[PDB]
């Protein structure tokens, strides 16, 4: 058959993995609720690059109107879970 169904824990772990592979973010400092603009001191271009990295990670495109408001890892996890119908 095809790939096993995706889970919330896997989504969050993969999001944190991608963010910890980013150089402008301290691995120790980073948290699921860590704000990008406020806590990590990032700008809009870094957020765009993070969104593109998430799209490359999960193999699907996020529209620009929705990606504008993903300012913490938890929001990205919620968006991915709701789009792919992941409930547990």
């Amino acid at each position: 058959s095809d790939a096993p169904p995706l889970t919330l824990e896997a989504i969050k772990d993969r999001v944190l993995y991608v963010l910890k592979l980013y150089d402008k973010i301290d691995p120790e400092k980073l948290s699921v609720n860590s704000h990008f603009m406020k806590d990590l001191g990032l700008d809009s271009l870094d957020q765009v690059e993070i969104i593109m990295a998430m799209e490359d990670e999960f193999g699907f495109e996020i529209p620009d109107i929705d990606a504008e408001k993903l300012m913490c890892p938890q929001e990205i996890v919620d968006y991915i879970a709701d789009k792919k119908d992941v409930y547990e």
Partner: protein, 178 residues
């Protein structure tokens, strides 16, 4: 897709969208990962060259010139994600999506199978019928007299209230319904 659009795009939003489009088309041109990374850092540097401009007129002219450059140098066959509006699997599973109201027309012999599912569906229908009037009342309360100004909807604010106009958002068939 999920967010209500605004009346217009700011200069900042247009700038970020142009940045993302240029990066994606450069990745389409630069197939390999290392070369793409090199030219993407070069693009980021050229993009940050005018990061702190204060004259809006010259910033707008720079944006127009950048858009012209992108259009002339875009990839005629850019990479598209399969489920994206241009992908090879964009609307592949639309024929498998059946609306939930079709389950009411099922024969009683069909509903003899799957009894618990239909009991829970009855529970959901009672919930919707008992919440609809409160949803309408809340929408009437929280709306300016000259009609709504945007496509945004308010959340629930009371103890046992549900967000107005939720049935057709919660009861989406699926992304892979079969």
């Amino acid at each position: 897709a999920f967010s209500a659009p605004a009346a217009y795009l700011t200069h900042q939003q247009k700038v970020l969208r142009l940045y993302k489009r240029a990066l994606r088309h450069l990745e389409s041109w630069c197939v390999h990962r290392d070369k793409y990374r090199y030219f993407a850092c070069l693009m980021r540097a050229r993009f940050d060259e005018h990061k702190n401009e204060k004259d809006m007129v010259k910033a707008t002219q720079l944006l127009r010139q950048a858009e012209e450059e992108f259009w002339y140098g875009q990839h005629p066959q850019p990479y598209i994600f399969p489920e994206s509006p241009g992908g090879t699997s964009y609307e592949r599973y639309e024929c498998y999506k059946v609306p939930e109201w079709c389950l009411d027309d099922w024969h009683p012999s069909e509903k003899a199978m799957y009894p618990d599912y239909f009991a829970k569906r009855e529970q959901w229908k009672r919930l919707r019928r008992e919440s609809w009037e409160r949803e309408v009342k809340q929408l009437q309360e929280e709306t300016p007299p000259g009609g709504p100004r945007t496509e945004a909807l308010p959340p629930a604010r009371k103890e046992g209230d549900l967000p107005p106009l939720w049935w057709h958002i919660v009861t989406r068939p699926r992304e892979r319904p079969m």
